[PDB]
Design a protein around this ligand. Structure first.
Ligand SMILES: O=c1[nH]cc(-c2ccc(O)cc2)c2sc(-c3ccncc3)cc12
Ligand SMILES: O=c1[nH]cc(-c2ccc(O)cc2)c2sc(-c3ccncc3)cc12
Lengths: 346, 23, 348, 22
């Protein structure tokens, strides 16, 4: 069937308009809601429609958040609309469809017993850090960074961050739930029960993604909340009293056996690019404030090849847009712009 | 470990218990 | 016992002057000449006097290069003067330098003897200052050509490093050929071994890379028994070069076929406890492709040096770090956008 | 003397690999 709705532009404005779409099929079902794929009649362009049950006298966090965003590495909100079980209200997020994920790409190499080419590791991570730099600049923390939430256009290698269903605009002093983020990517402060954490939890999760791309498997595969810390301790060792205070000031453990960190160079297979390991060690820190900011990560030596005039994908194609920074995106450290934007890009 | 974790966090035994499970 | 001579200031009115000094004692001999320690009568300050047999009417390269340099990380030329032996036309050039008591060589050997690895903080501090002095001299097109731990002077209290021995140094002019058999063997860049005459100042960066690696290993990374054996030691780590890399090293060299050897992993070259950023920096220095190596300024900006940019950093002896961020515009000439990294917030 | 000759004759790498496999 062809389906016609009255919908509001994502950005917008903001004047409701008629939108028609067809070829509606389910591509996901969860405790959050349902996701459909569809085709826009006027355009031909494919879209994902995320349908969520909505408390009619409450505002939706994800919507409010999605409306603020416009960035080449974030999934675009094209439209939103409501339905109508009788008195029941659903909010529908109409998103640009993206066929692949970093998960399903890394899984393909992992099953073929091989590692993702270094160049893609640079491309995906760099675009990830950019999306973080952008959302963090509004004070928005994603709270669910993982490979499944990193969409990929397999031809252009454009990465788009998706799934803001856990996202929140963080306000200091106002506490946030600790049981958040997928377990494998959950920062240690969260496991320790922090309610006063920051956007740097996303950087930790970004480190786990990086490490995972390097190992061909999750670096910290905890079987449970407690086991997740066991897994972290195997690599980082136990945290110092000062690191514990920095993660959660309201947590005290007077007595515990101290364990030294495992060397980073032995965590990864011997041929792992040393610069990838070096970057990893500055993301996977216990001390939340010692982690690199996303912008700082973007400027790391590891992404130097991306700044080289002559860089190409293995498929011969040019790389996607990497250097189109905005003042919003650079706001945490505006001077870094002259390093992030190479001379050949101005 | 959701109630277990909660108990470990409330009791101040998290690191002690994680270290034990390390062996 | 006061020795008095007419000497010319290193920088730089050019007007000659009577200079007196005392306590003249020999601190080193070699095929170059002699180095003395002495004490200036005029201020009590210690000096080194490098005496070299020199032949007019030919310029001394070392002299000309040294008269141009004024930098906290380069041994200062205070005066120079000529003297004569007694055997007709036997003329000596004397470089009067600021005396600096220790070397990176002597300090590393002390740690190696006591079966200790050099504390990583000192590795960052020494290397950073080395690269800073490299950026400085390279900005004039000057290539040192003999970077090695013995040529890095050290004040053991302040941890100030000063580059010295400009006896191999040369102002490189693109298009004008330079000699290949240069540098101390262990620190000699592979393009030099391949016979290149069209090389650049990136040969100092390779040598800097060998100093870094040595401080991490407690011994030389490439201890070749000969010129050919030097390439062997390099191949043991880097593997054989590609046809492209060979062309980048010396376009006038070709070898059609050769047995391929693969690189040894950087993480296995160093011991497990080696900081990953140190290895990473090293991997960006010890490259076959000379243009692929970091510039000295880029090297200064590498994350391995981030601890030095921390406002709270202290030397293990309790002292503050020396001046690290007083960059002039001449220093930043090759790359101003790097000032964002290089000069931290608290230092502006 | 020897290094110069291997450079000029284009036999450097061959000779170095051989020496490594001694
Ligand atoms: O926000 C989202 N939450 C959850 C899912 C989801 C849920 C259950 C599954 O089995 C798979 C995916 C998706 S799929 C998606 C998307 C897909 C393609 N182009 C744009 C957006 C957004 C979201
Ligand atoms: O330029 C130089 N060449 C060679 C030596 C040398 C000579 C014989 C050895 O056994 C060791 C080193 C020295 S020592 C030196 C110096 C020393 C202290 N403060 C300032 C300068 C400069 C030079």
């Amino acid at each position: 069937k062809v389906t016609t709705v009255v919908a509001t532009p994502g950005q917008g404005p903001d004047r409701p308009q008629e939108v028609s779409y067809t070829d509606t099929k389910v591509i996901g079902n969860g405790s959050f809601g349902v996701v459909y794929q569809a085709k826009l009649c006027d355009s031909g362009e494919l879209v994902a429609i995320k349908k969520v049950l909505q408390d009619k006298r409450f505002k939706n966090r994800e919507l409010q958040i999605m409306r603020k965003l416009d960035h080449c590495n974030i999934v675009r909100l094209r439209y939103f609309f409501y339905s109508s079980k009788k008195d029941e209200v659903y909010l529908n997020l109409v998103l640009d469809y993206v066929p692949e994920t970093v998960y399903r790409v890394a899984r393909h190499y992992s099953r073929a017993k091989q590692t993702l080419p270094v160049i893609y590791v640079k491309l995906y991570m760099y675009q990830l850090f950019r999306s973080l730099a952008y959302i963090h600049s509004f004070g928005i923390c994603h709270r669910d960074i993982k490979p499944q939430n990193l969409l990929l256009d397999p031809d252009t290698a454009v990465l788009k961050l998706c799934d803001f269903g856990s996202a929140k605009q963080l306000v200091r002093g106002e506490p946030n739930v600790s049981y958040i983020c997928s377990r494998y990517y959950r920062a240690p402060e969260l496991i320790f029960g922090a309610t006063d954490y920051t956007s740097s939890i996303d950087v930790w999760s970004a480190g786990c993604v990086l490490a995972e791309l390097l190992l061909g498997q999750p670096i910290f595969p905890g079987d449970s909340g407690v086991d997740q810390l066991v897994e972290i301790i195997k690599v980082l060792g136990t945290p110092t009293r000062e690191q514990i205070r920095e993660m959660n000031p309201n947590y005290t453990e007077f007595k515990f056996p101290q364990i030294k960190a495992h060397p980073w160079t032995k965590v990864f297979r011997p041929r792992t690019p040393p610069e990838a390991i070096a970057l990893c060690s500055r993301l996977l820190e216990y001390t939340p404030t010692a982690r690199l900011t996303p912008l700082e990560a973007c400027a790391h030596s590891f992404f130097d090849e991306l700044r080289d005039p002559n860089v190409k994908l293995p498929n011969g194609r040019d790389t996607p847009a990497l250097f189109n920074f905005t003042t919003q995106e650079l706001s945490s450290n505006p001077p870094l712009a002259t390093i992030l934007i190479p001379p050949h890009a101005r | 470990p959701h109630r277990l974790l909660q108990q470990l966090v409330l009791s101040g035994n998290l690191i002690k218990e994680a270290v034990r499970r390390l062996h």
